[PDB]
Symmetry: C5
């Protein structure tokens, strides 16, 4: 594990090969979660932000950007889309949460709450995942698409096993998040597979 | 009755089923009224905000959003439309009032007064209603349309039997309204019929 | 005569009947004038603001709005048009002045001076008029058109027999005008003929 | 020899008649100049702002507005254009300087410097001119057009036989200029031909 | 060498002839660099900013503007493009850096960092160059193109043999840069070949 504080993963070109694999010891399936990160891209096409696929289970947990202003969350093949007013090109802090009991999906872009949507109530997002950044998975760890690739900079990635209250999301936005148990940017276990460079975070 | 202070009804998807019925003991017909609420939607199509229908009397009292900036009030099949400058998508506080004697309809969007229009002078809006949120009624409690459905978040619903002065509308906007006698968000008698979740109000 | 201070005439619908006649005991013809008022409409089509017609003399003195930003003054069948940057929909304070000696027409929208235009130098605008608001006249007191009708709110109407200096126009804009001799909103002699309601001025 | 300070020339209509001739004792040809004025027009089409024509030479010195955000300078029939961000309709202060040794043309719009352009290096702009305002000349003091005429207001017109530094430019924009040797608004010899009125400067 | 402190090179027209050659004693090839300058143009088409070509090696180091908001860097025939929000027309301060080890290219427009891109990792940009401003080279010192020509003003050109930290880029933006070893605007060795004039920098 590495402390990636004040650092970023830079995906410098468009490809179907460059990605980062993220290792987490997930034995038990997800009921509740929150996922916070910082992203900087000048791409006007659609791309993947966070791709989580389980064994023969595609789009199990996917954070997808459709176009400028439109954000999508996939929970088990099913999607949900919410809109926001944003500047293109500009740095963005994204927080996304989901809860099984209600089926509610919360998106927070730049510490601002988007309209709540719901999908897959009573569902459990499966354990033992292949988590990739920079690429969208269409299988367990592979089957990438160049048109869905992320070219840009990714930082401040934290994932919790609970639904974070408004105060804690703003603490993450302000750059002082609470301890994260699934993924922590301060104790990150990663794997770089192609052309992905670690550089200091200069845009916050 | 429930106190729904600091809470919201979230209509998480588009359907022709999900709605909330609101129960009020209306014996005598309406001459004067004010109706205040908070709404948050990222829908660019037309939808209903407040649907009140009486026994064989469709669009008796309807608050309808046409498109971005355009708001409509229906008093007994007859409509009236007023315009405003607004951001899409964004949280909105709506106040609408009507008076029988003059026929005047006042709309206040974000504590800002819109151009006064008039309809149905000398009319009485009938008692014993079926009041639904999330859906538009084309009968007494039913006959819904998916294209007119509200997907989003509704909060701070208050209804009075009088025409509220400018000072009181701003008190409602500021989040400290005067006692409401038809409907009160602090003592709400409701019925949830499908997929509608109660969550905290995070957008004020 | 009535004191209409802090009040407005509300033309609540589109029609070819609803209007207000304004009575003024002048029958000496006009050389110089200033005309100040407040208007609030969400109409995107063309309409009349002030219609003054004399015996067999149409468009003798007409304040006409063409579209958003464009204002027209008619002095004896002859028109003059000036442009401005304005928000739609929004409250507006209009001042218009004309002088016979030079032929100069001054328009002041929200206390801001527009480009000076000239028409009908050496002309006298005739006495004994039929002054209507809410409708455009095509005869002496009648011959209205629904497409030229004003639906909205009119307030703070004052008319003087002189060309007002910049300081006095701003005093009118600020809501403290100097004594008016043709028409005074503090001592108004009017006639309502259809559906026109008096309500308090809530938009200043 | 008239003090026109706090006053403006108004060209009230579109014609092929109305112009103001400006007289100056210039006997020697110009190698260096600076020309300062204020203009207010709501014309969308192309127009002449300042026309200087000598015996046998059309477009000797011409300040021409092409469209919104586009200013042109003609030196001895040769053209140069510069772009700017500006609001339509708006009052403008224009500063144009030219130097023969370098060929450099310097435009200043509302105290902001434009991209320097070059034309006619080594040229001497001919003496004994016919200087007109409101119209574009095709001959010595005549041969006008209706489509290039100025409808609007001109004020604060000064002309120097030197290239003025940034500080002097800015003081002219502030409304505290340096005394001018070719044309001075505070001691001007002019000639009104047709319908052109002198009214006070109410704008900037 | 000359002190060009508070001065600018003005390329006053479009041509295929006017350019400035910049002489630097480069014996050894470039691994790392930073290149800072100020540019002012009202051209809406594509142009070259900095052209560096080596012996039979076109687009070895090229700073190219595609359109408004889009900036390109060429390292050995290979390009990289990044986007920004900018006003047209407006003065701009550009900083561009490249590092061989990582292949990372950093663009800073008005002291604001753009999205990092990568190209040509492990490459060395060759020595003994022909460096031209105002024109794009398609050979060693020549083969220009009218459509790729820069018309405008260039200033504050500094080039270093290292990748400059964020603090130093802002020092360059603020107008107080650290000592430059490849090119220094304080001690510039240049050659003017056509119509290019030296004038004071009035736009900072
Ligand atoms: C959204 O419409 C379609 O959805 C499928 C499934 O979901 C993703 C993100 C994917 O997994 O590749 O895209 C697929 C396809 O390319 C899109 O046209
Ligand atoms: C507005 O034009 C039409 O009005 C009718 C009656 O009113 C509502 C709101 C309704 O009750 O369903 O819509 C109906 C229809 O779908 C619209 O095209
Ligand atoms: C402006 O063009 C035309 O002018 C005439 C005369 O003037 C008014 C305002 C009027 O008196 O009805 O409109 C008339 C007509 O409808 C317009 O198309
Ligand atoms: C970008 O597409 C093409 O690239 C080549 C190579 O690179 C430059 C800048 C050049 O060296 O002239 O332009 C060339 C051409 O004109 C462009 O259409
Ligand atoms: Ca997939
Ligand atoms: Ca895919
Ligand atoms: Ca209905
Ligand atoms: Ca319906
Ligand atoms: Ca008429
Ligand atoms: Ca008419
Ligand atoms: Ca000419
Ligand atoms: Ca080239
Ligand atoms: Ca080329």
């Amino acid at each position: 594990h590495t402390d990636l504080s004040g650092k970023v993963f830079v995906f410098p070109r468009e490809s179907v090969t460059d990605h980062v694999n993220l290792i987490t010891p997930l034995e038990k399936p997800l009921q509740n979660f929150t996922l916070c990160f910082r992203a900087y891209s000048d791409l006007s096409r659609a791309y993947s932000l966070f791709s989580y696929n389980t064994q023969g289970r595609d789009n199990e947990l996917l954070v997808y950007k459709e176009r400028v202003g439109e954000y999508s969350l996939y929970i088990g093949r099913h999607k949900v889309t919410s809109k926001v007013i944003e500047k293109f090109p500009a740095p963005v802090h994204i927080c996304v949460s989901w809860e099984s009991s209600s089926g509610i999906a919360e998106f927070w872009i730049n510490g601002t709450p988007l309209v709540k949507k719901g999908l897959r109530q009573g569902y459990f997002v499966e354990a033992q995942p292949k988590i990739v950044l920079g690429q969208e998975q269409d299988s367990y760890g592979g089957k990438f698409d160049r048109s869905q690739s992320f070219v840009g900079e990714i930082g401040d990635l934290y994932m919790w096993d609970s639904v974070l209250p408004p105060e804690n999301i703003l603490s993450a936005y302000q750059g002082t998040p609470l301890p994260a148990n699934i993924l922590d940017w301060q104790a990150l276990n990663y794997e770089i597979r192609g052309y992905v460079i670690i550089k200091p975070l200069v845009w916050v």
